[PDB]
Amino acid sequence: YKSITIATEGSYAPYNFKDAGGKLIGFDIDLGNDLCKRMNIECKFVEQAWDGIIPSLTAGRYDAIMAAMGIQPAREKVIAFSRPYLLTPMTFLTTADSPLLKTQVAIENLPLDNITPEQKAELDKFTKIFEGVKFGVQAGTSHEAFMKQMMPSVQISTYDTIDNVVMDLKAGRIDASLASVSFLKPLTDKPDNKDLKMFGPRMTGGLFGKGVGVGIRKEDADLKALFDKAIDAAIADGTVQKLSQQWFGYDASP
Ligand SMILES: N=C(N)NCCC[C@@H](C(=O)O)N1C(=O)CC[C@@H]1C(=O)O
């Protein structure tokens, strides 16, 4: 390999978004540039809307995806992933004045790979509390998949970007959402968002899979091996931890 093109979305801060000059910035951009230097490959980042990001990769419009993409079983049917470069659970989001905040969380860390009756009881409790509450999620994400598969009785609206979800939650058009802690912690830590709060169980596994990874075509085994070696080195030397603290305000490195 000499040169590759990496697609990102550009609407998911602090992983990938646009600066004041319209340039793509964020953890995925800084990490991608560091990995390419390690691989001795020239890389160019390009913006791609979330809906077509996977088919444009398999159609050969670019060589990899770094766009806060969870390594999840459904996507693994279509593309390959590097080993994870970040780990994060998933949790809920509402407004700081919401009555939803008073709900007792019986299971703080809720793994979904093998749901026990106790874990199902906790998911069912939140489903019942959420029935009547209007949820908003970004379309085409594990957030949408979780609500449709695990909480089908809850009213959901899907959005083109997570930015539009947050806009509608702030405006009171929706009452709650779901996303990773890696997205929600920096969002709620901003003084701009003192009116927003994370809540509920922190979920992992199941349809969410594990980790955030670089999406690569299945046939590109050598490119996956190059990324895996570079990611292992960036984790080992503390680069991923450094970038995670810079962008997220905490260490989400594997
Ligand atoms: N708009 C984007 N560029 N990416 C949205 C990805 C959301 C979600 C997913 O892959 O479907 N995520 C995962 O399930 C774990 C990491 C990520 C998240 O919730 O932050």
Domain with 71 in it: what CATH number? Answer: 3.40.190.10
Residue whose Cα lies nearest atom 18 of ligand 1: it is 180
Token couple for 221: 């085994």
Task: Establish whether residue 67 lines the binding site of ligand 1, counting it when its CB lies within 6 angstroms of any ligand atom.
Answer: yes
Indicate whether 226 and 141 sit together in one domain. no
Asked whether 215 and 73 are in contact (CB, 8 A), the reply is no
88 close to 228: Cβ distance less than 8 angstroms: no
The answer to whether the beta carbons of residues 240 and 31 sit under 8 Å apart is yes
CA-nearest residue, atom 4 of ligand 1 = 68
CA-closest residue to ligand 1 atom 7: 141
Q: Tell me, in Å, the resolution of the deposited structure.
A: 1.5
* 81 in the same domain as 16: yes
Find residue 180's DSSP bridge partners: 90
Q: Which two tokens stand for residue 207?
A: 């349809």
Which residues pair with residue 8 across a beta bridge?
47
Confirm or reject: Cβ of 13 under 6 Å from ligand 1: no
185 and 137 belong to one structural domain: yes
**Structure token pair of residue 96:** 């700081």
Nearest to 100 by CA among 80, 127, 70: 127
Report which ligand 1 atom has the smallest distance to the Cα of 9.
3
85/73 Cα distance (integer angstroms):
17
Count of domains forming the chain: 2
CB-count exposure of residue 113 (10 Å: 0-12, 13-18, 19+): exposed
Is the distance from CB of 19 to CB of 58 less than 8 angstroms? no
236-244: long-range contacts (C-beta < 8 A, 24 or more apart)? 239/31, 239/34, 240/31, 240/85, 240/86, 243/27, 243/30, 243/31, 243/34, 244/27, 244/86
- Secondary structure element (H or E) that encloses residue 138, with its range: strand 135-138
Q: Which residue from 65, 78, 143 has its CB within 8 A of the most atoms of ligand 1, so it is best to mutate?
A: 143
CA distance 222 to 56: 20
Question: Is residue 81 within 6 Å of ligand 1 at its C-beta?
Answer: no
Distances (CA, A) of 131 to 80, 84, 152, 182, 229: 36, 34, 9, 26, 46
Best CA proximity match to 217, nearest among 78, 49, 51: 78
Query: In this structure, what DSSP letter does residue 206 have?
Result: G
Cβ pair 21, 217 in contact under 8 A: no
d(Cα 184, Cα 200) in Å, to the nearest integer?
12
Q: Which domain holds residue 38?
A: 1-88+208-254
Note whether 179 and 162 are within 8 A (CB).
Answer: yes
One domain, residues 81 and 188: no
Q: Look up residue 86 and give its DSSP letter.
A: B
137 and 198, same structural domain? yes
